[PDB]
Subunit: 123 residues, 4 copies
């Protein structure tokens, strides 16, 4: 088995691209995220992401999570998933995400959150 | 106006502290739990995230990741900080708890979802 | 303790009310859903729901699922959960839901689904 | 022109069938799995749902509930029926798997979520 590393350049079937840097010995990493599309009426810009990889038992397919701090809207996405060596020997990030929109009144909180799923593959 | 910095709790009986929020929107914090999805002994785990600063809002959205120290899992949270006129702050979140699975054909059952409100503790 | 039954009239935090009729031998039930808020701009009609309670091992706190076929929107909400006897001995539906919007292009499927959670309590 | 009625599969190897959809949008179908979250023997299971017929879309939304016959669980699916240039149909869906828990204090860990595409069998 290889080790499934988070570090490097990734893409998805939405055509978003994301780059993750070194993971430090606390599991932290930083990177950038450029989306191809958007839920808002706003102009897209690349954005920073920050997260961690779980290092408990030093697993080769670790779980992780990261936050995308969108720099062109009031939104936040969080991703969480696992870095897998797929059947064909490629590393793949299997993720799910929550997209939280900003709402003006707490009475609209019920509808502020979308969910989805994305595979990331090495670009 | 609404700020993430503080000690906070939820109805599961978890306590979370988040420290100061830097110019870039970043913070760190701790998360201690009382109930789990594992048999392993509970340890305090660290957390990192960001609050969105766009248009300098007073009820910002945010996300963070909790890096479990007692299991192989990872939980992410995202929500929005709501404040009233008395300055009562509440964090309305949803979360995803990703378990580790040994084989990729098990990925489908690895993700649990739920919501939690956090109150000032 | 008591059998937690879905049959009856319920309410939530959002001010929605719903009535579930009798549960049949197959665990099927039908009902109506009347909402006090939406994520559209139309006028609220009462909407039909249909679902099932799970009757394996005849649990007193059964899981269930149902579909709300919105009569004033091109959307569908599904709910799934468990009928509990709460701490205070009152019957409660603890549910999670997905709200699926119609999108016009397949490329926009990603953004079509919201998620939340609601307790229902007896009206 | 996108319709639910048919025999379907997904990448987990479950096959579903759905019957005719009546004027009231209702259907019934069956669901057979090859993998489960349970240790019990798989049995085929019934499903019930509706397609949304408002403004009579060629690509309607829908939801259904799978009444598991071999565990105490319920799964609900919701999505949209997409049909392409040549009549190729696909159902884009998302689901919630609700497990049974004994105490209300355990409600929080009871729901998993995922996504699946169904294609014609
Ligand atoms: C493009 N996307 C992507 O590659 N995803 C995996 C999903 C999760 S975040 C969303 C984009 C959000 C921009 C924020 C906003 O519009 O509020 C979508
Ligand atoms: C106590 N909890 C809490 O405050 N939540 C909002 C939910 C989401 S994280 C979960 C605890 C997970 C511990 C790690 C593990 O069990 O592997 C539960
Ligand atoms: C009122 N609601 C309610 O009692 N919920 C638990 C949530 C789940 S469905 C949504 C209402 C949707 C109306 C249909 C539409 O907006 O297209 C919201
Ligand atoms: C095979 N599956 C499938 O085709 N899915 C889309 C997922 C969501 S339901 C689950 C099967 C659950 C069986 C019941 C149980 O384990 O209690 C899995
Ligand atoms: C993703 O990468 C490709 C290849 O580098 C580039 O053509 C494309 O524009 C990138 N996507 C975005 C959204 O910038
Ligand atoms: C949380 O806070 C209260 C008082 O500050 C304390 O009694 C309790 O033990 C703490 N919870 C955990 C899970 O350690
Ligand atoms: C819910 O029922 C209550 C009491 O019967 C009533 O005041 C209210 O109108 C109902 N809600 C809606 C949205 O119809
Ligand atoms: C589903 O359909 C395929 C194609 O007919 C068949 O080989 C397979 O056994 C079926 N799967 C299950 C779980 O019944």
């Amino acid at each position: 088995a290889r080790k499934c590393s988070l570090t490097g350049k990734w893409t998805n079937d939405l055509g978003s691209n994301m780059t993750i840097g070194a993971v430090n010995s606390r599991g932290e990493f930083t990177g950038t995220y450029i989306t191809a599309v958007t839920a808002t009426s706003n102009e897209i810009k690349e954005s920073p992401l920050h997260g961690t990889q779980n290092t408990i038992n030093k697993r080769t397919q670790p779980t992780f999570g990261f936050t995308v701090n969108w720099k062109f809207s009031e939104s936040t996405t969080v991703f969480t998933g696992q870095c897998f060596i797929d059947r064909n020997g490629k590393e793949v990030l299997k993720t799910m995400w929550l997209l939280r929109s900003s709402v003006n009144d707490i009475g609209d909180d019920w509808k502020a959150t979308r969910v989805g799923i994305n595979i990331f593959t090495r670009l």
